[PDB]
Structure 1
Amino acid sequence: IETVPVKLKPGMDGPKVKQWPLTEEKIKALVEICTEMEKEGKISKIGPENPYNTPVFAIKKKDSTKWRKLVDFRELNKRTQDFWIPHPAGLKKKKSVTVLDVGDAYFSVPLDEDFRKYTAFTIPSINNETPGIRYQYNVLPQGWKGSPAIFQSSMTKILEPFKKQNPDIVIYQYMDDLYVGSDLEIGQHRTKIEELRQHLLRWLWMGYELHPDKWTVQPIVLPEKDSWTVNDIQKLVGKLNWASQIYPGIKVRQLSKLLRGTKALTEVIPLTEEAELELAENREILKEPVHGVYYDPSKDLIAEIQKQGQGQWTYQIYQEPFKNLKTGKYARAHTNDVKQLTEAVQKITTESIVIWGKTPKFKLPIQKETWETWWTEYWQATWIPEWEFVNTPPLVKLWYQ
């Protein structure tokens, strides 16, 4: 019922981010949402003496039809004084993990009055017909990195009756989300989390289901054929040459030896027994892990995505080139690439939160202007990661195909 001192980082002012255009239906949804928040004291109108701004938009959360307000606090999050949540390494090892939205608990906690000015946002008007409707927050805002930090004191006390009733459950908080993991059978997992809901009720309706996949890093696979054409062997040598940047003893000499001469690409080449031995030794090398692959919490996570076609997307997460920490494949709108990419980004970010407790920086196979025009139309999560754009087609797409 009392506020906590919160400041910015030294030598930095509050955010001054431009509001981007919004459709009429999103503007009206935000007008209704913010009108009720104002009556409930959560936000208040502000005057021209507040020069700060943070973008706002509207989403329809997964499996729902009512609009939700999402504030892009990425710039304020970069500029807010850090608050010092040891990420549980056991969460990634649990059989199932459920994501519970608990963001509404923040609105019952007041925000430091001196800091409120920095949370300012603007509901834009169509065609600049009026100046925007300007608001600032009075309570902890959803999406601000300081909200889980400040509420962590209170959140710990709510969960302790549950955590000691179930020492086997792992609970982790990131932003507005609670991640709840156990090793139980799925039926007994649904029930115990419906039990966990009996706390925000006393002291919110939906949940997300997650299961770790077989491999943290998918193995590099080589074809198994009975007849190899010149083209097949050229593609194999290229993939082995690329993998030799990752794996130590990959040899291609005996396989390149088969390509001796100036042969048609479709001519069948019998493999010699030395070449078949080299290929066989390469297979065994590729089934070992990569040497010297460790997570450093001080360094950023990088995620690259490749469009493979037919709704298939490959990705790799790393900190150092050729030292992949995780790789994967996202599959299955059969007509909208951008919607697919936006869902892959959210799925990769959720996996990154579970494993390392932070979001990666994306390298997106898309032009900036196309992505910035459309990604908000399909976004469904309350956090937003960072991203950059790839404008030159990487040769690497083949090697994960």
Structure 2
Amino acid sequence: IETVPVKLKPGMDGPKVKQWPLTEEKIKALVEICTEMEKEGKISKIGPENPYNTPVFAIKKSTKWRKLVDFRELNKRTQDFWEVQLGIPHPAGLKKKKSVTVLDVGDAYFSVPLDEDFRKYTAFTIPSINNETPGIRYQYNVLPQGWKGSPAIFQSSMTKILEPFRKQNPDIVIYQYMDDLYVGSDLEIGQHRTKIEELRQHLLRWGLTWMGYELHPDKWTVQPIVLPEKDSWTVNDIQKLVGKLNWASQIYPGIKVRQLCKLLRGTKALTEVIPLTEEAELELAENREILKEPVHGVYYDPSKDLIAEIQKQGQGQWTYQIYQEPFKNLKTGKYARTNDVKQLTEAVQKITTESIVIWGKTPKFKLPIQKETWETWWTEYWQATWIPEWEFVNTPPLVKLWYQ
């Protein structure tokens, strides 16, 4: 096979990202895997004249260990290649299908050799414990899993592989994103599963083998901001409500509070009850209607990054919002049901998966957690083969209460 030449975005050098410390268990697992990949020619040991590095991790995905390379940096620095030069167009139909199955096709890439002048940028290190040994250095000789360039390059081969199947099932949508195929149909679930098995057989002829089996995106609907319903309303309850309604108005146009504030006039004790006047009763009812419908004026812009915020609500509940401009929510949702970090990583993965399906992009996460805690623990429960961008924030205080 002739290799596709790859050039970095002008002025950018390759990644120089340090390896996060690994437990013995994972180091040992990585050493087995890499020893075997070396024998098979997929990777080769490198010398110190290669100054690059990309972190590596071990995950379960099953009880078998899998190597997960964090190419987030290489991906940012090679964006012109995989997005503009060799972009994979994202089908709008995928999210409309009743069932979507996600298949791992990462092994496909290991039979295609990587441009020799690019290999150096895929350098990585297996560290040792207590800096006993210098630590084992490799680069890739073939398309590596986790690099967005790999599917960009394999795109032409994937099309040949899928051509018969597509031709025979023209109402099935197949989308490739990183190491995975997303396969959507409107069929009855048994028929759907049969066509998936059929697809597996096609793939098998080219040497290839927080979520249910399938995804059901047509059964994804919004989380309305919900206003409580009561017989008796205290000053506090109306205050709470007005605060909730107030913030809600920045997102939704038409939200009105005039009447509600009229009740609070004076310097009233918080516990004291205030019977609702008919105008207020009705103002409340009008807002209530507005919140059930979508946001007028808010549209996905492909030239912009997606952002995800998540809030811990207690009792295993987490809310989230995805937007490109603050308050211009494209999607909002809830995730439920361990410990906090486990739940959070589950939520992050589910939100990312929905994001791939809806837009063909992963969002940048604002995570309500301490950096080091996250960095220590996230790999223990991570099962995806991609990794989204993230940063760390302080959530508080009522952005929490304004949802759920």
Same structural fold, with TM-score higher than 0.5 when normalized by the shorter chain:
yes
- In the other structure, the counterpart of 1:77 is 75
1:218-273 Cα deviation digits (max 9, x unpaired):
22221222211222111111111111112222211211111123333222211111
In the TM superposition, residue 49 of structure 1 has moved relative to its aligned partner by 1.4
Asked whether 1:38 is paired with 2:38, we answer: yes
Q: Residues 216 and 325 of structure 1 are in contact (CA less than 8 Å); yes or no, is this contact kept in structure 2?
A: no
The count of aligned residue pairs is 396
Give yes or no for contact 2:211–2:350 (8 Å, CA) kept in 1: no
C-alpha displacement at 1:215, in angstroms? 5.2
CA-to-aligned-CA distance 1:143-174 (integer Å, 9 cap, x gap) = 01110000001000000100010001000000
CA contact (8 A) 1:101 1:206 kept: no
Are the equivalent residues in 1 in contact too, given 2:61–2:382 (CA < 8 A)?
Answer: no
- When structure 1 is superposed on structure 2, of 216-225 and 336-345 the one drifting more is 216-225
Matching residue of 1:213: 218
From the superposition, tell whether residues 177 and 278 of structure 1 become closer, same or farther in structure 2 (CA, over 3 Å).
same
Change (3 A) 1:207 1:41: farther
Secondary structure of the corresponding residue to residue 116 of structure 2: coil
> 1:100–1:206: 8 Å Cα contact kept in structure 2?
no
Over 3 Å counting, the alpha-carbon distance change for 1:83 and 1:207 in structure 2 is farther
Confirm or deny: 8 A CA contact 2:114 2:141 kept in the other structure.
Answer: yes
Change (3 A) 1:207 1:178: farther
The alpha carbon displacement at 1:217 in A equals 3.2
State the match for 1:355 in structure 2.
358
- What is the CA deviation profile of residues 2-40 of structure 1, one whole-angstrom value per residue up to 9, with x for unaligned ones? 211112111111111111111101000000001111111
| TM-score scaled by length of structure 2 | 0.95
CA distance, structure 2, for counterparts of residue 215 and residue 390 of structure 1: 27
The 3 A distance-change label for structure 1 pair 207 and 340 is closer
Q: Report if the CA contact (8 A) 1:367-1:391 is conserved.
A: no
Which whole-Å CA distance do the structure 1 matches of 2:68 and 2:61 have between them? 16
Normalized against structure 1, the TM-score is what?
Answer: 0.95
State how far apart, in whole Å, the 2-side matches of 1:291 and 1:118 are.
45
Unaligned 5+ residue runs, structure 2?
Answer: 83-87
Deviation at 1:392, TM superposition (A): 5.2
Unaligned runs of 5+ in 1: none
d(CA) in 2 for partners of 1:305, 1:81? 27
SS at match of 2:30: helix
Separation in structure 1 between the aligned mates of residue 380 and residue 292 of structure 2, nearest angstrom: 41
Describe the SS at the equivalent of 1:141: coil
The farther-off stretch of 239-248 and 91-100 is 239-248
Q: 1:198-347 to 2 correspondence within 5 Å?
A: 198-203=201-206, 208-212=213-217, 214=219, 216-332=221-337, 335-347=338-350
Q: Percent identity?
A: 99
Measure the CA separation in 2 of the matches of 1:268 and 1:243.
24
8 Å CA contact 2:61, 2:383 repeated in 1: no
CA shift at 1:300, angstroms? 0.7
1:25/1:369 CA distance change after superposition, 3 Å: same
**Contact 1:99 1:207 survives alignment (8 Å):** no
C-alpha displacement of 1:357 = 0.2
Q: 1:392 to 1:164 in 2, by over 3 A?
A: closer
Question: d(CA) in 1 for partners of 2:54 and 2:158?
Answer: 27
Partner of 1:116: 119
C-alpha spacing 1:90/1:170, structure 2 compared with 1 (3 Å): same
